[PDB]
């Protein structure tokens, strides 16, 4: 397991940091868009009301 933990987690950390570099940007892109629904909804109700 210590061989696996080493081999696998090193691969995981490389796959993670490679993904993270590309996907943390796209996360922010996707996550800042989600916050827009939460304000687009909250205004919707006050206007309906």
């Amino acid at each position: 397991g210590r061989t696996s933990m080493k081999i696998q987690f090193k691969t995981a950390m490389p796959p993670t940091e490679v993904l993270l570099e590309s996907i943390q940007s796209k996360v922010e892109s996707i996550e800042q868009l989600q916050r827009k629904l939460q304000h687009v909804q909250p205004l919707e109700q006050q206007n309906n009301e």
Binding site: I30, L33, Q34, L37, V40, Q41, E44, N47, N48
Partner: protein, 58 residues
């Protein structure tokens, strides 16, 4: 990410549809307010005329 942009724009279209109909209802009210407010003004003027007219007769 593209799906989320289609989902977002739909909400803000409804924000406008509500915005327009809300201002449209208030727009109709406004005319009514100004219609009657004049009529009340007409009534009060006539009211004050009698009030002094009845005195000046007596």
């Amino acid at each position: 990410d593209s799906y989320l942009k289609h989902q977002e724009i739909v909400l803000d279209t409804l924000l406008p549809q509500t915005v327009s109909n809300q201002w449209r209802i208030n727009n109709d009210y406004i005319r009514q307010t100004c219609t009657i407010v004049e009529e009340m003004n007409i009534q009060q003027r006539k009211q004050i005329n009698d009030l002094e007219i009845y005195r000046k007769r007596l």
